[PDB]
Amino acid sequence: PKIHYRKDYKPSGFIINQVTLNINIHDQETIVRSVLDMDISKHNVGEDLVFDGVGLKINEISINNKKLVEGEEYTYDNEFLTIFSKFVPKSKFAFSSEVIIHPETNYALTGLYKSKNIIVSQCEATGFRRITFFIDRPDMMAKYDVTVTADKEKYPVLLSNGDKVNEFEIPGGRHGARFNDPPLKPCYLFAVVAGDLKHLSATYITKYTKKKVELYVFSEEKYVSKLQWALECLKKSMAFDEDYFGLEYDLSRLNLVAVSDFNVGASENKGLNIFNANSLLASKKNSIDFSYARILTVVGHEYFHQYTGNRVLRDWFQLTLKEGLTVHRENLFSEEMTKTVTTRLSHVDLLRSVQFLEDSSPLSHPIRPESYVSMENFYTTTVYDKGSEVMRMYLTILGEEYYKKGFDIYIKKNATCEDFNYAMEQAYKMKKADNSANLNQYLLWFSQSGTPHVSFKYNYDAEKKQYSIHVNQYTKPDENQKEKKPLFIPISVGLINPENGKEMISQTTLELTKESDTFVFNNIAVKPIPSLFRGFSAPVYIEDQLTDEERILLLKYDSDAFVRYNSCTNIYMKQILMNYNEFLKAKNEKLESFQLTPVNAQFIDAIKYLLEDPHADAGFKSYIVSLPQDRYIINFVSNLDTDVLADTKEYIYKQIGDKLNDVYYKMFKSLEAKADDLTYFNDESHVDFDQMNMRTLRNTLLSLLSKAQYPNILNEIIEHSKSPYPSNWLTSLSVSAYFDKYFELYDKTYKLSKDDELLLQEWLKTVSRSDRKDIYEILKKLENEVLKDSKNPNDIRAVYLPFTNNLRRFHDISGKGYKLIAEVITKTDKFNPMVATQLCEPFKLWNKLDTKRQELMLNEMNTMLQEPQISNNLKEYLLRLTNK
Ligand SMILES: [Mg+2]
Ligand SMILES: [Mg+2]
Ligand SMILES: [Zn+2]
What we know:
One of its GO terms (molecular function) is aminopeptidase activity. The record marks 264 as: Important for substrate specificity. With 884 residues, the chain is α+β, with helices and mostly antiparallel strands. Among the domains are: 1-195, tricorn interacting facor f3 domain (Immunoglobulin-like, Sandwich), CATH 2.60.40; 199-311, Orthogonal Bundle (Neutral Protease, domain 2); 320-372 and 381-447, Neutral Protease, domain 2 (Orthogonal Bundle); 454-545, Sandwich (Immunoglobulin-like), CATH 2.60.40. The chain is 40% helix and 20% strand. It has 26 helices and 29 strands. Strands 6-5-9-3-2-12-15-14 form an eight-stranded mixed sheet, with no helix packed on it. Strands 17-18-19-21-20 form a five-stranded mixed sheet, covered by helices on one side. Strands 10-11-16-13 form a four-stranded antiparallel sheet, with no helix packed on it. A hairpin with a 2-residue loop joins strand 10 (111-115) and strand 11 (118-122). Helix 8 (548-557) runs antiparallel to helix 9 (561-589), helix 23 runs parallel beside helix 25 and helix 25 (851-865) packs antiparallel against helix 26 (872-881). 48% of the residues are buried. The site of one magnesium ion (MG) has 4 residues, from loops.
């Protein structure tokens, strides 16, 4: 296992100036001819010429049109092509090769592969080496001249980077297309698409230069009518980057292409973005509401890669520089487009659940790691989502005006993470009106792993009208740093007058730079309730040390969506932790009788208050009636007994339900007209995020009412199944799990879903997530009847991943759930190591569970590690997760 270190970076001893590709696609094989116009760099020390090349079948290789001989002049071990230095020229030379690859049987979905009837490429991060020989690293900038040939019937549409400069016929029913892309680019931004694609098109005219831009969205013929929303999102993305960042698209054409088989959401390439079908295609009739926010964000994300990618990555350790930034730009875009507070809330909810788990797991790493073995395991929620929060904090610190200045300085001057911090430091100096002000401490956000803990204590003096906020920050030591240093933590705060719910001070961002600090406020007429970390201004554990009474007041009257949301969350956690220990204590002591502390009555009253408030947001309401995610809860519990937590959740839901179920039912009925309005059902460009939030609320309330066995709720469930919206009649399936009509809706909703590839995958998720006692028997049914031996990641993930969130069933004390997923992981690892690693996600919290379940998970992981044919990808991941 070769380990790459960040501190060991050195520029290549070679230069690649021009790439001339000839990709000839045939029925059983794809022939790739490549001519590399190379040179010797100043960093050269007469070393061997080593190319990356994985799984390549060599027909012949040459230097200056002279064939090289195997063994005497070069060696190849299916991974590296080593050409001995004595046969390597000392000036400008040309390296040529012809290799054979097989996209048809490339089930790893990396490099060049075939998805259904579409040939597509995936080169990030180390995929280009699976297509042809190359110095496969992002700092190798080169020009590209690509020619693609194939059978005209099977692959009438040919796409690649740059301008299509020639189209020609080939004897035998074949055709060819030449693409020249003059601007320098790294090889992971190379792409090629071949297939029988249909499209929707539009013309975008830029804001300043008024350049006309051809926009194309591609898919297979069957689902071409699901491309409308993606096209609209693309238009929205371009306009936003123009309006907010003042950036225009540089090329004359942009292509979006959807494929059925894809490891992640999408990928960016210059002028040619390639999407997972579930993140590009949608229709009101064949998609749940989630697809619309999903497509918006993903289409936006890959577009925001364009302008930065056009002018500025030194090495893969700087991954968070382009990903953290893009996701940040993606999130700013989504918030502006959706105009809903739940958008920002959704991002925070994901970070504090998924990423916080990772950052306290053995897999914990900084957003810029010091080392890696597999680059495929580098693309984590830490690099992406914590990285985004780090990039977002720049905006919070600098403000909108100065941030755009710092951003413009970054784009114009350029790279590494330090380069971006430098540009922001320049804006920081301007804002602070001082050249001695710096952001050197801020770099610790890039190098320090783990989640910081921020705790508070307060003091108010009525006589002097003086309010003090004592802040403390702390990060637990891990395997990355023995000693943790204080970070630059921006704390957006407000002060709420508890008597009238008014703001007491203007916008304020506390700059915590030390381990602890005391912030004092004068002329505070009355004792305030602090509104801390507004908008979640820092990726930290917040310990407000407020009473439930104070939290309730914030929940009702604070202006900031997150602090309201977080206050409700904190009230829940306090209740959860209390009831958990009470349930646990009874279990450990085998008590015949015991007591549970009821849910705060005033808290329940506050929920009723907000719910019955017509001017309150529907999406926000859905959050406050829902307990915190299980993966968020586990961060606050040692040796988590999943059964006890399940009992705890059940009791708390029942407590609140016993009070508010009538309110829940009344709202479910009254919300129907606006939530399920069909006015624009066949207007595929009309998306109402507020309306979809109303359906989110209705479906959430229906779920609560179903679990509570509300009187005659089955009637509502049945009628809900007749709704035109997939979000509704799929919800009816899952909530009917507690009734004898589950399998009736099972067949009904299957018939509705089976003829759409993406919709069926949503049906699989719904079944997988169904709260059924016979869930293991049901999963077997999906395997034999629906899933079978499919190698489609969307199919495999849909069947198994939602099931892993079943607290009671997946964590069955027998370990049957752990054994099931482990078998799926090992099975998947044979053809797709990346997806196999994705399926390991349930095991990420293994050392946080009770001792018995720790043992069970560890055994299955050790079993997987003992598999003789385990991939390096999977091996490295499990080794790090099990601290071996
Ligand atoms: Mg091969
Ligand atoms: Mg990507
Ligand atoms: Zn990205």
